[PDB]
């Protein structure tokens, strides 16, 4: 599914849709929990390490400066959102 | 022959030998669930009720076929999304499995403000205004449509509805539910006229359709939202501790609703027991048949009571020598979850053919929800009949008579928009009654996928004995209205309703005097109506009950009592709820009071030029009904 | 008992021994003339009719008091002035003695353009547009209100009305006359609700009130104007040769109207002969009593017929053993020169108490105007009764029967706004009849000071024999509606009315198919109504005529026939003429045709979304009346 | 009445009303048939001379450059109006 998501993310940015708009399209098209829009690749690595460290139950795939996160329980989904807000 | 005591026993004897829980069990089998309006399983249960009416050997069975436009979920998922820090942080709250029918298809994004239940009082008692922001509201108190309308009235851009655990003690926090946000009844795309092929479906849109997207969310989704919101919900609201008031400064909510319309074929199934004296007059007994989920409590109990009431009354006529003077109609409506659509299209279609023939409607919908209280909402014409019924019908649990409060009529609430008996009374001028055995809290599983028979029998172990008393109440209603040459409708009950209106209006006599007006003619109308009802009781007293000519001369005056309260000065198409007592619109008597209350404040919320017209038409609507009840036109007074 | 032939003769004998000309003479005496609405002489004639009803020994006599707003002359004179060469040449045309009630008080100045009678067709077939100019129109063909409304619709700033000598052969060329320009009926400041004190008279203005000044001028004043106007009036119009079309280049007309409102007390006088079987149902016989001038032909003849009709029928009940099943109501309205105000306020006030009780209204107004023709305008339910009456009522002069045209019903015109029987039929759903002995030309002295008895008997020498036949027609109407167990109302007469509508609509089958619509459901409704009338006729055939219950069970279905044609989808306050056949508004069947007529022309006058709603609501109004007439609700089989 | 008209027209002109407006006021306040507004005082008598010669049944009074004409019959009133247009 990671292959399908990263390929759908390729088209939205090439078509000219904004990163913030593409984030909303991704959440309504796939079973993803939280998406973060980042500036440089440094924060993308910072955010990806931070969320995997504190919540290892989550699968995080990333493309360009947009990071996608898939988790399943309400409680874990809560922690991912709180972890992403803290490290942003 | 058979008197009332003989018929009361023959009804009570057949009630003990009736198994209601097995019928509700049959209506909740896998072949009839789920039955959303227009679905295949809806047509299956309709065909079953149609065959059951023939086996009961009623006088005639027929069906109506309507093509109404409903709203259903789309292939595109509805979503609730939180965005933080300029759209660079997004958080999926819920992809709800439920939806609100007749919501606007749009995507709104902005601040989220809590407004308690969404009533007009709740929006007034708020720190934050809801201008340009999304509103989240608890289910209850008022209908979904009223919540959306009050939010639209203050320029809100969206409404979210959830079920907190305090008012709805549900273990599953991820439970979705269903509703509709149409501020009216019937097919909202044929407002005021029937949804038949003859009309050829012209472009017409009801003014009750909202213009903002509204979505339902589970309690878990609402608690997801509260984690991004500030402010403590007041202790007055008596809600969960996780409750919050307003989102943070940099956090917004993106509501995405994409529901679509769907033209569907609905079926109304009918059965009639023709009368023996005046068969052109008849009582109507109805019960909603469709439901979003299984609808055991919402639709299953109602239809089960309707099926067995038709079986018992048909058995009494053929096997026990029952001879009702007027006829009895049993009706199983569809599309009830969208807003009494099946029943409204029948009224809007055959209004001419039942103008002064159908004189009472009994609604069995949601008659069994609990066991603590027995509540009733009905027209005052049926208050006396309801009081007489409660004095010889015993509570299933308590065993005592239902009549325990002598001031019960002063505590009755009027019929609401979501009740299938409301359009019968407010639009067609037919006296209606809705009753139920319930508790002080709402049945939590209504409109959900957990409205199953399993959850209904676990909450009500004596379901058969409770459903039997609900049939005994509705059964005694039908017998009292059809067997005697006199109608058990009490026209004198409106003297208290009129006197309460004149007294309530007289408290603002100070505002009236300074506008150069006087309530003296409204008192004159109340007294003229009181003497007309006293004269009719005298005429009924001195009447030879066997003289059929004098009796139906007096009965025709009684069946006109409810009709003469429909406002004669408003368009029934654009304002169908014409009843000045129980309808909606500026023509109603409560609307007159709300306007005059706005005068003491110096602001221009008062209209005056409207009030003077409201007072004029309301005064003559009462005076006109009084003069028609007094008798002939030449027997009227002049000053 | 007494059968029809016994009652026809018992009525005809008392008609010959009745002096009608002496009553018309009495109503034109100095004590009752002139009787403008609310005047002292108007109240005097009211007490005479009230006392005469007591002397006739009716079952009950009573009266209603209404407070309506009329319009009267001001202390400031109304003037018509011609201005030439930049206000430096002034020419007084007339300070008229007449006026138009409910005209706007204003002073307009500009071009004057002739528009013949002012009908919608006349304004369409005009070279010069009337936008921003004053319009002058001949009286007749249509009411004053229709003339003003059609001129306002094209942005006219004022209306002048005159009487040419061709249409009105009057010797006095300086004669002034009176009218009103309210496009409706009743007190125009209490639209839709009665003018009682209970309403406390809230601020409400009828949408039929014009917003341009309207004035009446004599023929001499019109010829003064034509001397300043160019262009020859077309020979199609058949008017005077002095007629002209449009003012000169530098000449304008200054119309100055300053009329004022006046709250007045009007009196409706009533008398009733109670029935013997079903007295709660009744027929109503009415006649206007007020008039601007003497109103001998307008009001005197009508009230005189009403007085003697009540005397004859009361004599028949007490002295000849007449026993009508239903009751009879005699009514003398006031404020009749205005928008039928006295009759409309009664309907708007007691609508609940006569909902399904009053089943016929007979209008005696202007029943004698000439002697050549016998004209009738009525609801189709009374066509059979009118035809049966014309077959045994002899013409006053010829002595031949009135029934001479076998295709007479196809030539009947519908009731107009100025007729007092129009609101009974178009608003309350009560079948109405208006009839008169008249000539092919309008009675010239109507609404003038020359509507005296002297001019009426001089033009109609056999006034007594003519007023007797007019009373015999109205008398036979009342007897046929009250003596038999059958109402003599013919519901089958609407089958031709519906068939005529479908035939007219079939002419636009090309337009209907082209918008994706179909006339098949309107075809079904026309047939379902035909079957409903056949089922009711069958039920009447198999009915035990002595069984009082089955007869009133069937009669109650007949008394609903006219009511079920009032549009249930319209506001009775803002559009009170709800009858889809005979009312006014977009809900009427002619309005459906008039709109669809605008589609075959490429122009964008057509309103599709309105027509689709018109066709929808009109289709179900017909189907609903058919389903209600078939019988019970469960006994309505259709090909739905 | 000639004195009353000449004095009432004097007041209208003294109050500041124009001659053209004062002409219309006289016709609706007095029993006047035709009023003509002229340039000089020579024309005022010339118009009055012309109208008195051809319609001697008319009483013609004049004040300043406004000439007032009173006639009673429809035909004579017509002839006066036509005479004033001819000589204006
Ligand atoms: C129902 O409404 C109608 C219409 O509004 C109303 O009729 C009007 O009533 C008033 C009050 O009685 C009438 O006015 C009076 O008329 C009489 C008759 O000439 C006069 O004598 C009165 O003069 C007295 O009052 C004056 C007040 O200033 C004094 O100045 C004077 O010196 C006298 O004391 C007064 O003008 C009016 O005429 C009628 N309207 C018509 C058209 O006649 C009626 O009263 C209302 N009914 C009820 C029960 O309220
Ligand atoms: C009364 O009105 C309804 C609503 O228009 C009519 O039902 C509709 O009838 C048409 C034609 O029979 C149906 O069209 C078909 O639609 C299906 C959709 O899958 C399509 O596959 C077919 O090729 C065809 O186009 C339409 O579906 C149907 N609508 C519904 C909701 O059932 C009805 O026929 C009318 N009745 C009469 C007597 O005119
Ligand atoms: C107080 O309430 C009254 C209603 O009783 C409001 O009067 C309403 O005012 C509007 C606007 O003037 C009217 O709309 C008009 O409709 C006519 C219909 O043809 C149209 O021609 C006009 O151009 C205009 O659009 C409306 O009819 C009128 N209603 C009534 C009953 O008179 C009034 O506006 C309210 N006041 C306030 C401050 O809200
Ligand atoms: C064509 O007719 C329709 C139907 O009357 C008009 O639509 C109405 O427009 C007014 C003003 O917007 C609304 O108050 C009504 O509710 C509308 N009625 C309906 C059924 O939509 C429309 O304005 C007309 N068009 C023209 C150009 O006259
Ligand atoms: C009438 O309408 C025409 C067409 O626009 C215009 O030229 C003319 O000036 C108008 N006249 C008046 C008096 O409004
Ligand atoms: Ca509808
Ligand atoms: Ca009125």
Numbering used by the authors:
A (entry chain D), D (entry chain C): 1 to 88
B (entry chain A): 121 to 759
C (entry chain B): 121 to 760
Task: Give the published text.
We sought to use our protocol to design a human transferrin receptor (hTfR) binding protein. hTfR transports transferrin (the major carrier of iron in the body) across the blood–brain barrier (BBB) via receptor mediated transcytosis, and this process has been exploited to deliver therapeutic payloads into the brain parenchyma that would otherwise be blocked by the BBB. We targeted the region surrounding an edge strand located in the hTfR apical domain. This domain is distant from the transferrin binding site (which is important to avoid competitive binding) and is exposed and therefore suitable for beta sheet extension.
However, for strategy 2, one design (designated 2DS25) clearly bound fluorescently labeled hTfR. In the 2DS25 design model, two helices on either side of the central beta sheet extension make contacts with TfR across the interface. To probe the sequence determinants of folding and binding, and to facilitate determination of the structure of the 2DS25–hTfR complex, we created a site saturation mutagenesis (SSM) library in which each position on 2DS25 was substituted with all other 20 amino acids one at a time and screened for hTfR binding using fluorescence-activated cell sorting. Combination of these enriched substitutions yielded higher affinity variants. The crystal structures of two increased affinity variants (2DS25.1 and 2DS25.5) in complex with hTfR were determined to be resolutions of 3.1 and 2.8 Å, respectively. The structures are virtually identical with an rmsd of 0.26 Å. The structure of 2DS25 superimposes closely on the computational model with an rmsd of 1.2 Å; this is notable as the fold is more complex than that of previous computationally designed binders.
